[PDB]
Each structure stands twice: as C-alpha cells, then as structure tokens.
Amino acid sequence: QGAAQNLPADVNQLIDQLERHCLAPDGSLVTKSVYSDLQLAREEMSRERLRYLEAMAIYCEAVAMVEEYQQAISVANHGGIRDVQGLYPQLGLKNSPQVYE
Amino acid sequence: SIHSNTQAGLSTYVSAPAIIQQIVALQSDLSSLQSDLENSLPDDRNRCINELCTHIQNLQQLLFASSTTAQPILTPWPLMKELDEMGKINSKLSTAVEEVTLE
Amino acid sequence: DREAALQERELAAKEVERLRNIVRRQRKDLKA
Amino acid sequence: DASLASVLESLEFCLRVRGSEACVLEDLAKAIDLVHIRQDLVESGHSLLDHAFRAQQKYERTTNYCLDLASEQENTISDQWLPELRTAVQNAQASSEHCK
Amino acid sequence: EVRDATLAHKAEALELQRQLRRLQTQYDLLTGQSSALIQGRRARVAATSAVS
Amino acid sequence: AKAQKESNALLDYTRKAIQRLTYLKKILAQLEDDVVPCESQMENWKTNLE
Amino acid sequence: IIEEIERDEAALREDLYSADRKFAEYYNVLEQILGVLIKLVKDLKLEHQHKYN
C-alpha cells in the first residue's frame, strides 16, 4: 500500500529531473523557447515596447489632436449639445494642430 | 506534465489543428494528482499516519509494556525463576556439580 | 514547554480550516 | 486559444487562476527554472502520502519489529501460559511440599 | 514533543497566512485593475466613426 | 492545505516521537541493557553445554 | 515578478516540502533508537531473548 502511494510521485520523478537537461532539446523548447530565447518577448525591454509606450504620448491625445477637427464638425451634426463646445476643444484648444496638420 | 518529456514539445503544433485535445490533456495531467493525491491525502493519512499516530504513543508506554514486558515477561513472567534460578544451579553451580564428583 | 506548545498548536492548526474555504471562494472569483 | 489557456485547468481548479495568463509574465523563462527543482523533488513534495508510509515501512515497521514483534513471539504463547502455568505452578507446589 | 509539532503546525499556519492577505488585497485591488484601461475606449473610438 | 496541512496535523504525533521515540531510544536501550543477561543463556551457556 | 513568480512557485513548492523537513526530524528519531545497532535491535530487539524467548 505504501509503495502504491509513492507511485504517482515515483512516475513523476523518472523524467522530472532529466527534464532540466531535456529543456534544451525540443521536448520543451516548442513552448519553453522563451528561456532559450531569454525572455522571448523582446529580451525584456530595451527599445521595442519603448516605441509603443512612446505612442501613449501620441495615439492617446496627441493623435486626438488632428482627428479633433473632424470630430468638431462631426459633433456639429449629431451631437448638437457639444456643437458649441466643438470649436473651443478643436478650433481653439487644438488650434495648435493647424501647423502640425 | 514534466513527468512526460514531450509535454511541451508537442502542445503548440497540435493545438492549432486540434484545440480540444491538448488543453484537456494538461488538465488531466495536473488533475492526476489533485484528486489522486491532493484530495486523497485527507483520506489516506487517516490510515497511514493513523497507524503512525497510534503506534508512536503505543510504542512508548503501552506497546512498550507489550515489548519490554513481552519477551522476558509475556511468556516468561513465571519463567524468570526458570530463567535465573535455572542459571543459578545448572549454569552458576554448574561447575559446582563437578565438586561432588571431584571430591 | 509541551503545554505551552499545545495551546499554540491548535491555533496554528485552526487556521487551516479558515484558510481553505475562503481561498476556495476568492481566488476562484478573482478570475471573472 | 486565449480563452482555453486560462480555462485550461478547470478540473485542476488550483492551477486555473494560477494558469490563467501565466506565460504572459514571461515566467516560462523564469518559473520554468522553478518547476524543474519542484518536479525532481516530487519524490518528497507530492510523495508525503508515502513519506508517512516511508516513516512506517522504512523505520516504524522496524520499531514494530522492535515493539510489536517483541510480543509476536509471545502473544500466541500467552494462551500457552495456562499449560505453562501447570509446568510452573508445579514448581509452586514444590515450594508447598517443603512447607511441611 | 508538541514543540516539534509546533514547527509542523506553525508551518501549518504561517505558510497559509501570507496568502489570505494576498487574496483579500486581490479582492480589493483586482476588482478595478482591469477597469484601469477601459476608460481609454472613448478616446480611441471617437474618430473611428469619422474617417469611415 | 489539503495535501500536507491535513497530514501535518496528523504528523504532529510523529513530531511527538521526539518524546515518544526518543523514549524508544531508551526502549531500544533499556531492553538492549537486558541483552547482556539474555546473552548469558546462550553465549555463556554455550560453554555450559560441555 | 521575480520574487512573486518564485513565491507563486514556493506557494506550492516549499509548502509541500514543509512536512518533508519534518519527516526528516521524524526519520532520525525513527533511526536514532539505538542507531549504532538498529538492525540487530530491530529483528530481535533483545539480541538474545528473541533468540531464546
């Protein structure tokens, strides 16, 4: 009975220890390539996600700048409540985009 | 699944054709010890450690009496006089038996 | 020291009952 | 694939919220360094269902050989003590014979 | 004896102690962690109905 | 908690062996002390055979 | 991530080893019962009473 208790642990340990040495072969790197790729994401972060966290500077509101002119007239059609406020946000606050356009 | 060697060497290129087999395959693996061990440790430690629990206290005071007073007592508690006095005459006075023959 | 160890043993053991079901209820619903 | 990865461990509900989005952490390069030392040590970690039996079979059975077996050679003979008494009480009456 | 058992029981206590606070914090922090990015939807959707 | 903590709650009696089975050291010793009187009935009585 | 990933591992890793360290403290007292001659004092306890009992 006691040896039967260890059997699920016994069958595990047969290849468990070798699977560290099996990690380098393809038996693991088909998924575990990230270790051989050293954080396969981008080798942590040096520049790649920097190119997109720099986009948070831009696509969030600095890209809202150019499309705000289109919204102002678009708001003027269906959003009549904000039609008056469309000019202040786009034609006045985002007027600095006129050079940037 | 590390108990198997290709547990990671096969998952990706079978998931794309068949996205049902591998996901439940790892589920069956990890659950091969959650209900066989993790949900079955409570049942089996009330039989194994139960023997450990009962014996360890038993081994110290009661089975101690059933051991220390078993091999020199349980059969021989009246045979101590058949153990020591037997050695008093036929082992200690054993050389003294030759005394009558010698003198 | 056994009696001192005995009183602290049950409190060190009573936590298991209160650290299974609430865990069985939270980490399950910290996924929704 | 995204849903079935998180819902992969529904039966292994302990690993389910654990295995919801684990590899997004890139722990497959870090936690895999820990699953290895975990699994070669399953001979102790999971195996504590047998360690008590190992506590029993490897050594406590020997303690039973020290304690239980010290009576196993006399427990059945405990009934033989009754005729063995007749061999021993016959010595007791030998004390009574020299009383007079 | 129970002093040795306390180690088997303090581990039966301490090991499970630093996880309830984890979940309790999770139940008080993860309820809004995912919502901390949904609010950006409005900024990303306004002009989607414009260029089209 | 369902794997070892239920066992560790049961394993406390195995921890109590540091009082019981340490007493078993004596049990394995005070009975070992009895071996010398018990060794007499064969080892010393092997000479008694002649 | 570095501390917690191990901690998430060590959550299930060293907790299942918590009893294991205590088995060793029970294995020695299992063996230290006249450890110098345990095998002779286990098959017979009394090395000679079991020989004559």
UniProtKB/Swiss-Prot annotation, chain A:
Predominant localisation class:
cytoplasm
- Superkingdom of origin: Eukaryota
State what the entry records as the consequence of deleting this gene. Lethal when homozygous.
Q: Can you supply one Gene Ontology CC term for this chain's record?
A: spindle microtubule
Keyword annotations of the record: Cell cycle, Cell division, Coiled coil, Cytoplasm, Cytoskeleton, Microtubule, Mitosis
GO terms assigned for molecular function? microtubule minus-end binding
Q: Which biological process terms from the Gene Ontology are attached to this UniProt entry?
A: cell division; spindle assembly
UniProt-annotated location(s): Cytoplasm, Cytoskeleton, Spindle; Cytoplasm, Cytoskeleton, Phragmoplast
Disulfide pairings: none
Q: Give the record's subunit note.
A: Part of the augmin complex composed of 8 subunits. The complex acts on microtubules and interacts with gamma-tubulin in spindles and the phragmoplast.
The family classification in the record reads:
Belongs to the HAUS4 family.
Q: Summarize the protein's role.
A: Involved in microtubules reorganization during spindle and phragmoplast development.
Q: Know the name of this protein?
A: AUGMIN subunit 4
UniProtKB/Swiss-Prot annotation, chain B:
* Name of the protein described by the UniProt record: AUGMIN subunit 3
Q: Which residues form a coiled coil?
A: 18-41
Q: What does this protein do?
A: Involved in microtubules reorganization during spindle and phragmoplast development. Required for gamma-tubulin localization during mitosis.
Q: How does it assemble?
A: Part of the augmin complex composed of 8 subunits. The complex acts on microtubules and interacts with gamma-tubulin in spindles and the phragmoplast. Interacts with AUG1.
List locations, semicolon-separated: Cytoplasm, Cytoskeleton, Spindle; Cytoplasm, Cytoskeleton, Phragmoplast
The species is Arabidopsis thaliana
Which domain of life does this protein belong to?
Eukaryota
- Source gene? AUG3
Concerning its family, UniProt says:
Belongs to the HAUS3 family.
* Cystines in this chain: none
Q: Which residues of the whole protein are included? A: 464 to 566 of 617
Swiss-Prot record, chain D:
Superkingdom of the organism of origin:
Eukaryota
What phenotype is described for loss of this gene?
Lethal when homozygous.
Q: Where found?
A: Cytoplasm, Cytoskeleton, Spindle; Cytoplasm, Cytoskeleton, Phragmoplast
The family note in this entry says: Belongs to the HAUS5 family.
Assembly and partners are described as: Part of the augmin complex composed of 8 subunits. The complex acts on microtubules and interacts with gamma-tubulin in spindles and the phragmoplast.
User: Which purpose does this protein serve, as stated in its record?
Assistant: Involved in microtubules reorganization during spindle and phragmoplast development.
Q: Can you say what this protein is called? A: AUGMIN subunit 5
Gene name of the encoded protein: AUG5
UniProtKB/Swiss-Prot annotation, chain F:
- Signal peptide residues are none
> What is the designated name of this protein?
AUGMIN subunit 1
Localization (cell): Cytoplasm, Cytoskeleton, Spindle; Cytoplasm, Cytoskeleton, Phragmoplast
**Source organism (scientific name):** Arabidopsis thaliana (Mouse-ear cress)
Q: Which gene encodes it?
A: AUG1
Question: Quaternary arrangement and interactors, per the entry?
Answer: Part of the augmin complex composed of 8 subunits. The complex acts on microtubules and interacts with gamma-tubulin in spindles and the phragmoplast. Interacts with AUG3.
The record's similarity note reads: Belongs to the HAUS1 family.
Q: Which residues form a coiled coil?
A: 15-35
Tell me the classification of the organism that encodes this protein.
Eukaryota, Viridiplantae, Streptophyta, Embryophyta, Tracheophyta
Identify the segment of the full-length protein shown: 150 to 199 of 299
Query: Which top-rank group of organisms is this from?
Result: Eukaryota
